[PDB]
């Protein structure tokens, strides 16, 4: 269960950011 | 020079709700996580969630869903915990504290707490 | 959950001593990828806010003293004082940052023996 909105959405943001 | 500067105590009376602030300072708001602790009165840490302040999106323990909400408020550098529906069990010492996101995750430790705010409901 | 145990609740050490803290873990705390215990050390003396010693179970945080020390992996887990001091005297409890929600141990407090 990996799959969590809150987990992919920090790295994709993260990556936006960076 | 990190600093988590939380509101003063709250005198409030059961059935109403509450909005504690945590202003940040000495560093980018954005790049940390912001995370909530409850404590009560001789009593072990409660963690209630967190929120991603440049994404807006939070993450909430299941016991306080309902209870607990988070927001950032960028302009301000400044992160709310409101709680509603308040009762004698809601009285407590509301810590704010800042999490690292490096490699854009967020399991990591709480390196720089707040002076808590404590909330007292009394009728 | 994961469910944090501390024990003892409560420590009557002597000024110099070793004073060694345990912190049980219902659940394992080793990530298997980087071999990392996802496992925080706080302390938080009377009235004030916790503040961060050890993390990672064993690295030490910028200006903690080093007779501070982590140690164990998976699920036990432990915070060694070589010589404690007077200042010392606090509730220390750990974190497991590992999975949400995450959760904290009761505390062990420290006191002088007498």
């Known amino acids: 269960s990996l799959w969590n909105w809150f987990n992919i959405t920090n790295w994709l943001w993260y990556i936006k950011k960076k | 020079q990190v600093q988590l500067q939380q509101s003063g105590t709250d005198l409030v009376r059961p059935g109403t709700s509450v909005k504690v602030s945590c202003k940040a300072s000495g560093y980018a708001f954005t790049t940390y996580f912001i995370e909530w602790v409850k404590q009560r009165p001789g009593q072990g840490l409660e963690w209630i969630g967190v929120?991603?302040?440049?994404?807006?999106?939070?993450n909430y323990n299941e016991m306080f869903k309902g209870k607990a909400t988070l927001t950032a408020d960028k302009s301000s550098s400044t992160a709310y915990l409101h709680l509603s529906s308040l009762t004698s069990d809601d009285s407590a010492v509301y810590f704010c504290?800042?999490?690292?996101?490096?490699?854009?995750?967020?399991?990591?430790?709480?390196?720089?707490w707040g002076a808590g705010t404590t909330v007292t409901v009394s009728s | 959950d994961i469910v944090m145990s501390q024990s003892p609740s409560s420590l009557a050490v002597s000024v110099g001593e070793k004073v060694t803290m345990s912190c049980k873990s219902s659940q394992s705390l080793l990530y298997s990828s980087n071999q990392k215990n996802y496992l925080a050390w706080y302390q938080q003396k009377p009235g004030q806010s916790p503040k961060l010693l050890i993390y990672w179970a064993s690295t030490r945080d910028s200006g903690v003293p080093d007779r501070f020390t982590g140690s164990g992996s998976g699920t036990d887990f432990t915070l060694t004082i070589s010589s404690v001091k007077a200042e010392d005297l606090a509730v220390y409890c750990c974190?497991?940052?590992?999975?949400?929600?995450?959760?904290f141990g009761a505390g062990t407090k420290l006191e002088i023996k007498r």
């Open positions: 504290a800042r999490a690292p996101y490096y490699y854009g995750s967020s399991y990591y430790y709480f390196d720089v």
């Open positions: 929120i991603n302040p440049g994404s807006g999106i939070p």
């Open positions: 974190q497991q940052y590992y999975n949400y929600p995450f959760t």
